[PDB]
Amino acid sequence: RQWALEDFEIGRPLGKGKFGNVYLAREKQSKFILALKVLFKAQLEKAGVEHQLRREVEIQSHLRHPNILRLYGYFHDATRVYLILEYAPLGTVYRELQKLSKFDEQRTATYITELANALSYCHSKRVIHRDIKPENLLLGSAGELKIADFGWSVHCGTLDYLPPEMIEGRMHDEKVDLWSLGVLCYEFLVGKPPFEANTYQETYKRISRVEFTFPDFVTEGARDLISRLLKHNPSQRPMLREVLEHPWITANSSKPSNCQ
Numbered sequence: 001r002q003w004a005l006e007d008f009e010i011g012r013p014l015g016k017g018k019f020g021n022v023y024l025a026r027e028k029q030s031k032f033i034l035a036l037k038v039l040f041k042a043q044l045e046k047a048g049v050e051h052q053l054r055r056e057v058e059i060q061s062h063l064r065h066p067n068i069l070r071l072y073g074y075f076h077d078a079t080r081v082y083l084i085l086e087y088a089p090l091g092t093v094y095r096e097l098q099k100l101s102k103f104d105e106q107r108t109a110t111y112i113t114e115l116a117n118a119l120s121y122c123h124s125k126r127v128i129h130r131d132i133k134p135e136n137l138l139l140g141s142a143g144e145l146k147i148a149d150f151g152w153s154v155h156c157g158t159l160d161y162l163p164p165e166m167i168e169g170r171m172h173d174e175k176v177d178l179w180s181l182g183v184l185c186y187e188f189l190v191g192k193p194p195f196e197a198n199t200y201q202e203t204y205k206r207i208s209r210v211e212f213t214f215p216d217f218v219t220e221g222a223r224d225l226i227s228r229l230l231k232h233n234p235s236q237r238p239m240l241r242e243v244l245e246h247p248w249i250t251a252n253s254s255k256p257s258n259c260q
């Protein structure tokens with residue numbers, strides 16, 4: 001499957017990445033609409049992540065889930081690398097949050113269900129995601145959440161989404177992902193992450209202490225689920241099935257909890 005740039009018509013820019021642009025594109029022979037991520041080789045070398053990318057792309061290609069952004073292939077020229085991605089027409093959960101300001105409990109519950117399913121599935125493949133941010137959550141045509149970044153591992157930057165074990169320089173595992181769900185569940189409902197601060201060093205301290213509080217409009221069931229997930233000790237974090245079978249979740253979600 002040796003693709004080349006001449007195989008595609010390039011359309012509008014879908015957005016910027018630090019390492020490269022993403023463009024709507026269409027494969028000429030088939031007319032298949034997709035996304036093309038363009039990464040500059042110099043930068044990948046310079047930042048010494050080029051091998052990070054490689055690892056992640058290899059993990060990514062092995063993932064088949066409706067809640068995980070599909071990677072169709074890759075190719076490169078002298079100057080750049082290119083990832084051929086599934087096109088997610090409805091944008092990022094990040095933009096949706098900016099426009100809506102905050103989500104209702106049924107949209108939140110549905111997104112947490114879909115994230116949890118995606119992660120159950122990854123955990124079942126001995127795959128663990130690094131931090132998960134709204135910027136890296138894309139939406140398909142029916143508005144289904146898709147995890148779009150390849151930040152996985154079998155074994156910064158803003159700190160807002162990182163767990164204490166990962167900032168405190170400790171040992172991290174699948175429970176990292178459980179923390180992620182808690183940060184996102186709070187953020188969806190409130191409109192900002194629970195440990196947000198005006199400085200790295202601030203945010204560091206809030207996370208390490210697990211120092212946050214709820215606005216009055218957050219309900220008891222949401223509160224209960226978030227407090228159970230935002231646990232300094234990873235082993236006290238619930239398992240993904242317990243998230244899927246949480247009364248707040250089953251009561252509010254539109255999707256069922258595929259474990260299976």
Ligand SMILES: OCCNc1ncnc2oc(-c3ccccc3)c(-c3ccccc3)c12
Nearest residue numbers: 014015016022035086087088089090091148
């Ligand atoms: O690895 C993910 C690359 N990015 C994408 N990949 C695959 N599909 C996509 O659709 C988007 C997108 C969709 C509609 C509106 C705007 C953007 C984007 C997009 C790219 C960069 C930053 C923000 C969002 C995108």
